[PDB]
Ligand binder design. Sequence first.
Ligand code: ATP
Ligand code: ATP
Ligand code: K
Ligand code: K
Ligand code: K
Ligand code: K
Ligand code: K
Ligand code: MG
Ligand code: MG
Ligand code: MG
Ligand code: MG
Ligand code: MG
Ligand code: MG
Ligand code: MG
Ligand code: MG
Ligand code: MG
Ligand code: MG
Ligand code: MG
Ligand code: MG
Ligand code: MG
Ligand code: MG
Ligand code: MG
Ligand code: MG
Ligand code: MG
Ligand code: MG
Ligand code: MG
Ligand code: MG
Ligand code: MG
Lengths: 461, 47
Amino acid sequence: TIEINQLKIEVADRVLVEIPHLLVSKKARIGIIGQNGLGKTTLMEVIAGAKEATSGTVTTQGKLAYIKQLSTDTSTKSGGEKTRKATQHAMRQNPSVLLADQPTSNLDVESVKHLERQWSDFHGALIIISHDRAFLDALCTEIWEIKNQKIHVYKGNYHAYLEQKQQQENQAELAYKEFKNKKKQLQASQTHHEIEAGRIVKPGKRLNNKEASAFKAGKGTQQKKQHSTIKALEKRIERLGNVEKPHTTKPIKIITPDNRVIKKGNTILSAKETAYEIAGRKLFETKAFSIKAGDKVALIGENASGKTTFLKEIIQENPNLLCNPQAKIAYFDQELNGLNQTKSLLENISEISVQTKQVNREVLGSMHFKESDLHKEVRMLSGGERVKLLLSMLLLSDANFLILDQPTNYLDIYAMEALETLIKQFAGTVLFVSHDRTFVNHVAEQLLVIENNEMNFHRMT
Amino acid sequence: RVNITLECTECGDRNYITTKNKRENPERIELKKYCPRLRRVTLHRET
RNA sequence: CUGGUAGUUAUGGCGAGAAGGUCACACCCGUUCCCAUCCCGAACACGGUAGUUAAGCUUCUCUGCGCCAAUGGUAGUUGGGGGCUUCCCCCUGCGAGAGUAGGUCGCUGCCGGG
RNA sequence: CUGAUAUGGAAUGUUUGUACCGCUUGUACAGGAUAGGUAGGAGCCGAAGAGACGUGUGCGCUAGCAUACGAGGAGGCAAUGGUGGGAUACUACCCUGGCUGUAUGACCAUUCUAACCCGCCACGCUUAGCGCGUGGGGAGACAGUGUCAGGUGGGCAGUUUGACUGGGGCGGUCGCCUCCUAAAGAGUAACGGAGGCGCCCAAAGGUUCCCUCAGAAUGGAUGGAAAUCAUUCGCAGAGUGUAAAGGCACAAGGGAGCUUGACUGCGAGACUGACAAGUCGAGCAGGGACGAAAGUCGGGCUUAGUGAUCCGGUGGUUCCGCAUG
RNA sequence: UGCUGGAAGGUUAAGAGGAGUGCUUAGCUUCGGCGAAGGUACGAAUUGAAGCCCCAGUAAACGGCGGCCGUAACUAUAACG
RNA sequence: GGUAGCGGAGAAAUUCCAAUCGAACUUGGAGAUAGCUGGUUCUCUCCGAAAUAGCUUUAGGGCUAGCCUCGAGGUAAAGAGUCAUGGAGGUAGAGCACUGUUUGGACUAGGGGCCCUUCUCGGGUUACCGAAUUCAGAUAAACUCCGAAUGCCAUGUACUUA
RNA sequence: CGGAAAAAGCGGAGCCGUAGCGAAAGCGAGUCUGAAUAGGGCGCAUAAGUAACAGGUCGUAGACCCGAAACCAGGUGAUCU
RNA sequence: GAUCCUGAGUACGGCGGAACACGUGAAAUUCCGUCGGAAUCCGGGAGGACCAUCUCCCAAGGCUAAAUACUCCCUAGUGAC
RNA sequence: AUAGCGUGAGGAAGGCAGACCCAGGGAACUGAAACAUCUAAGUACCUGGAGGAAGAGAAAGAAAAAUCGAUUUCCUGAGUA
RNA sequence: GCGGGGUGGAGCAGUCUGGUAGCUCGUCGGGCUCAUAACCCGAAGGUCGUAGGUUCAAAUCCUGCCCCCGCAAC
Ligand SMILES: Nc1ncnc2c1ncn2[C@@H]1O[C@H](COP(=O)(O)OP(=O)(O)OP(=O)(O)O)[C@@H](O)[C@H]1O
Ligand SMILES: Nc1ncnc2c1ncn2[C@@H]1O[C@H](COP(=O)(O)OP(=O)(O)OP(=O)(O)O)[C@@H](O)[C@H]1O
Ligand SMILES: [K+]
Ligand SMILES: [K+]
Ligand SMILES: [K+]
Ligand SMILES: [K+]
Ligand SMILES: [K+]
Ligand SMILES: [Mg+2]
Ligand SMILES: [Mg+2]
Ligand SMILES: [Mg+2]
Ligand SMILES: [Mg+2]
Ligand SMILES: [Mg+2]
Ligand SMILES: [Mg+2]
Ligand SMILES: [Mg+2]
Ligand SMILES: [Mg+2]
Ligand SMILES: [Mg+2]
Ligand SMILES: [Mg+2]
Ligand SMILES: [Mg+2]
Ligand SMILES: [Mg+2]
Ligand SMILES: [Mg+2]
Ligand SMILES: [Mg+2]
Ligand SMILES: [Mg+2]
Ligand SMILES: [Mg+2]
Ligand SMILES: [Mg+2]
Ligand SMILES: [Mg+2]
Ligand SMILES: [Mg+2]
Ligand SMILES: [Mg+2]
Ligand SMILES: [Mg+2]
């Protein structure tokens, strides 16, 4: 169906993807994975024809429907509603091959279940990007890792991928172990023959001057033979090869400046019981509550539940929701409006940082942005890097009260673990949303729950 | 830092080769250079 | 005489001191127009002459610094020849640098006003 | 060792595949609620058996849907409205799968036997433990043989395994730039003394205009030995993308604007020089940039930043094109 | 590392397959060019063994059989950690 | 009597296979190839080198150039030597005007101590040192404000000479 | 062919030179490059070759003479061991 | 000239090799081994891949002197041996 | 019945000229200033067949605006393509 | 001279890939116990040998020195 050949995808100075040959089949079911910043979405756009490659070709067959990573449809609907709209639109188009970039970003459990069932029953080609491991297990039968600027192909589910990957890991460690050992072994023998060679020409005490002088030349030749053994060992070391140490990918963790340390137990937000509505239609009834300082408050709900609406009410300062003074709110949106798409990111973050330049750069380093990235447009960034930008900007702002609608969207496992660490260690206060049960279990000290049009509060997990 | 052919827009004929730093100049360069086929100055962009 | 403009290796300069002038050169006055300054009518640019020779500028004085500067000798040296050969001596020719006697506040030329 | 194929054929059967007939399948969200699509569509089904009730089975998103069975016997649903991307009845053509049935077509397995094989027996040629023939028995489409292909392969083979060098060897070096040596033109060796290169710059180029540094003395709020500021002194004690030498302040050092001459064809003549190559080049033409103009501009203050042919690749072309096109 | 055994998957040939693409031209076109059949050059999917990757085992198989700190009523050393 | 050399036999040593064995003897390809050594035969006459550059799987080889010879050419006679004149050039020497190395003296930021004290803050300060700054004097292949002799480039009609 | 192992005669097929330039098409005392009529390269201007002999040298052949250890092919040898 | 015949497991093609000056090269032509496998007169081959057109020619069967090569020999003879 | 056995009629067997040619099989030394493709070379050598010659040979040819008419050998083409 | 290393008290990572101070044992404190150990609860302790560089920032990249363990030399 789809043929890919000699494909070079180069972004600026770096080479993003390099592919000798690939081919996709009818009835295929593919995952395509990799850390943030590696070129999944760019490759996808290049297949779809949204983007051109510096080299090589793609050759398609039939209709292809391309769901995008980032919703541009600024509109009056929920994030999940927008995501499912785009998805069902792509499927309504009746495609042969179906392209998809992180479709489970803003979805919940029921929507993910219905999606994975519908795409099981789907018959035809499809390519998926997602970090949902269970979703990939449910769906895909081939898996393409964009690692080290190349595509490493794997079969079976993500389960079997992890299996074959662990085999490769162990296999490489074994190889490097052997290689280092042989090198120590032969280079030791090389030192041994150096010692011998140095001794070949120093006569014993037992010898005489005149007697020793007679075999100087033959001992010189013994010495020569030793040196020849040495050079032979060096050749064998060359023939071992330049076996490379295996790559230990560096962890992520966020480094936060000590903004303000107001007392654990201080009431940060008092919210009285109130029924809410945005177009007149009722969303839910708040039963009253308070939120104290140091609280890691989760906020839970289905799609279109009232969550983002409630956060907007907070930051707009409804008098029914009194955040105390000295609170220093800092907001992150589902649809990333908090960035200026005009500015470079050093601008976007050095304008909003109350903090030192060194500290600004430390936090960017903790998000693992390279020196190459600082002058990139916000238009120019991964779905994950934009999230990291807003969160890094949020941490530079002097805030004592973070508030985060779905930061788990376009993050990998390393960054989700680092964010978990952040929220779990954070000195101030935080109110987050996420449809990841894993993240919310790992992080939630307290819970705000929306169910059957009833909001509630629980100091549980 | 990479070598770059420059093709003409009216011809598509690769009249020049030069260089650029591929980070500080990430885009296809455009420069006005003489095209000997046409015997006039013409805009050439990178390939 | 003075305002420009040149050439000449600073003997031509640096410094100090003195006299003179809206005839010019200026300083100065103003920003109304051109045009201007990472700001600023300081500069540039424009429009004017109320005050002044204080300074720039012209002229003059000097040897403090600087620069130039021989003569004689010494060094080194081409060639030749001697030895005692880390090196050195002699014959002929050339010949310093340093330092000194001494020189220097410019010297020639063109155009215009007066 | 392994596979394909010929010698080399007859069945049966599993498991997949392909096409066809049938029968069930179709739930994001919102929405009466299980909405596949396209179109028709306002009426449509049905006492020759409707809705609804009771039971089981199957599916499944576990909401309910379909399917048959007992009684019963005519009633139901849609249109309409709203929901929504889209409408509900029913009709047909589709699509997506799932099952039955057929028909084809692969892989693999089991069996058979007539090819092939038997270093099994009996007989015969025949006084023969060879061979061949005949009859049985046994293996049997395997083996073996040929052709092709992958793997293993020091069992065997043909060869390679640097030069300088105070002997060879180790160590170091091998090409390019800069100083000293190098004896005041040039050149000039050593396993002689010191360092650098295998780049960078879309402005660190071109032009036009503008100005001038280091460091010290003080005076000063954070601010200090030393940030920035004012005055004075100051031929360069700075800077010159990068090593050093030469050179540069009437810029080649710093800013700003406009730009792309970091152009095409070439080039009298010189330098250097074994050859290969390297270097400088006024000027002519074309068409431009800057500047009023003069005029400057064929990269960067200069000198390193690189590698032959052969073979391949890309683009282009009023070239050829093995009788003619 | 070899040897043995396994049998799910990955990689893996020749051969089988032959989607398609160029060249050609009977006609169609105006020049440019478009072009059925056939022939021709090249050929993708799919299929495709052993071996290798992989898992167990195996040393009278090839082979291999370590460091640092402290510690006793004290002087040393360390049964011990 | 059998085993015969890409082989055989080996109580195994590179042992033996007709006085030959890390691969027999013989014949042929075969006049192997040899950048290696040796040798290369009569006479006189004229001229007469080099042992250098550069490149080289190159270093005791080769190739081109430089150097020799023979022949023929061509002239705005170009060669060589000296004299005169004009020039590039930074050596010897000398010098310190920069850069380094350095001696003595003046003088000091600052460090160490005795301390007075004391929130050791600031002083008495010490020749116990001491960055630097400055005066005089030394030194230099990779230092130069200077700077020869010689040698080099040329010009000339000078004066000889080939 | 002719003929004495001759000499003539015959034999003009072919070879060299007379025109070069260009990768070639091709143009031609010009040609190639190039936009050029420019300049420059090569040529012509600036005209002597050819056949045979002899001398020098070079190449292919053993190529100056002698000389390896070794390699390959066909055979002979177990009367020694 | 109704009809019929005109060299079949070849001619070609794939794979593997070789010979043609031609080393798989764009590789025509010829031959060997193995797989496949034609038309046969409105037919078939070649003209250096290949296609069309044109031209030339009839394979897969056989025979064939002379001119050419050599000299253990015979006869007569020659030599700036 | 064939095999087999026997008899009779023919035929061959082997040698050389250390030459010339046809086929089967087929080196290395050497050269490339190493060397492996390549060369040496289809040479030397083995073997088989022969004959006085052999082999080849009467176009499924060579060629191209023009045709020629079986093979072989020599001169040229040409050290060209 | 050649290799390893020098990170709380001990042993070890982390360095190659600059922002991340970690594992085990131990120490201090409070509990349990008649008391010690074990166990349970908390906490401290490293400017990464050192002096300088590069960088916005260094355990980490560059340089010099000083130490320890081996191996050589002697
Ligand atoms: N036009 C561009 N210019 C420069 N850099 C770009 C451009 N487009 C993308 N990039 C960068 O190149 C990289 C490729 O990002 P890309 O969106 O392909 O990653 P991803 O793996 O799909 O990300 P994610 O997991 O966040 O969705 C990122 O670092 C991105 O910022
Ligand atoms: N400005 C608005 N006007 C009209 N309707 C709105 C508006 N904002 C939100 N809604 C509606 O309110 C409902 C819930 O809105 P909201 O997006 O805040 O939900 P949510 O629980 O945060 O969802 P999610 O996590 O999926 O984004 C949706 O039906 C949405 O369409
Ligand atoms: K013998
Ligand atoms: K010309
Ligand atoms: K061929
Ligand atoms: K023909
Ligand atoms: K014959
Ligand atoms: Mg992305
Ligand atoms: Mg061997
Ligand atoms: Mg050989
Ligand atoms: Mg040597
Ligand atoms: Mg010199
Ligand atoms: Mg043709
Ligand atoms: Mg195995
Ligand atoms: Mg031995
Ligand atoms: Mg030979
Ligand atoms: Mg010989
Ligand atoms: Mg003489
Ligand atoms: Mg001196
Ligand atoms: Mg000197
Ligand atoms: Mg014998
Ligand atoms: Mg043919
Ligand atoms: Mg073939
Ligand atoms: Mg051949
Ligand atoms: Mg064949
Ligand atoms: Mg042809
Ligand atoms: Mg050779
Ligand atoms: Mg750190």
